[PDB]
């Protein structure tokens, strides 16, 4: 046949893949972590968004750190041979490199390691997307008025769509959901049939950066801004359509 191009991930496997959504709203009293009002709005929005993209969505609520690790391990041991991709969404408290179970922290590297190129072989070469709504620290953004080869890296083909910049808090509205997840679902709804995923996430960055600003009776937390951060180790373009 004719000349062929391969700069995009193959997304026409029989199934798009799993979308695992871990929604941690209520935390054990002993941890002292506050309940995350509005996170159910995020979880429902993500479920509908990924359903329309033809993902097999599984929603999990209020998981302990042990349950998160066991879930991720079990999912990574499934046969994904017939699936194009894998998506995991984490909605919780966090700090840099850490996501909270209801009873304590989970190392993000531990979770993602289950899906490494050498450890989940049915996902080797396929995009593994981790979408994270959680704090990455406690900084606030004040804003400003305007030969060939035969191996691939085991860390290749991951993308971390993080709600906020490294070191910073991430904002969630108790009524509307988190700024990032609201924006992500809106941009996926409007553009998943039109734009490559990096370009969609860039529009999410713009929406969060331009349309939201915090309101607080506490001057320390008032009038603050947020920029999400895309961390891409993908090796091809990702279109949700084919």
């Amino acid at each position: 046949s004719g000349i062929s191009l391969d700069n995009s991930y193959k997304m026409d496997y029989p199934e798009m893949g799993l979308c695992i959504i871990i929604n941690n709203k209520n935390f054990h009293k002993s941890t002292g972590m506050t309940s995350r009002s509005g996170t159910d709005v995020d979880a429902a929005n993500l479920r509908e968004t990924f359903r329309n993209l033809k993902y097999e969505v599984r929603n999990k609520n209020d998981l302990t750190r042990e349950e998160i690790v066991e879930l991720m391990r079990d999912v990574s041991k499934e046969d994904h041979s017939k699936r194009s991709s894998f998506v995991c969404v984490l909605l919780s408290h966090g700090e840099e490199g850490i996501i909270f179970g209801t009873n304590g922290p989970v190392d993000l590297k531990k979770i993602t390691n289950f899906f490494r190129g050498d450890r989940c072989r049915s996902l080797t070469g396929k995009p593994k997307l981790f979408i994270i709504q959680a704090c990455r620290g406690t900084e606030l953004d004040c804003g400003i008025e305007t030969m060939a080869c035969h191996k691939i890296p085991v860390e290749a083909d991951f993308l971390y769509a993080c709600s906020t910049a490294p070191g910073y808090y991430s904002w969630r509205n108790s009524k509307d959901g988190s700024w990032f997840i609201q924006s992500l679902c809106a941009m996926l709804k409007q553009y998943a049939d039109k734009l490559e995923f990096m370009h969609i996430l860039t529009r999410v960055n713009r929406k969060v950066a331009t349309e939201f600003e915090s309101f607080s009776f506490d001057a320390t937390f008032h009038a603050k801004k947020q920029i999400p951060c895309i961390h891409s180790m993908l090796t091809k373009e990702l279109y949700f359509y084919h």
Binding site: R36, S37, R172, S174
Partner: peptide
């Protein structure tokens, strides 16, 4: 508005 709340932080995570």
């Amino acid at each position: 508005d709340e932080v995570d």
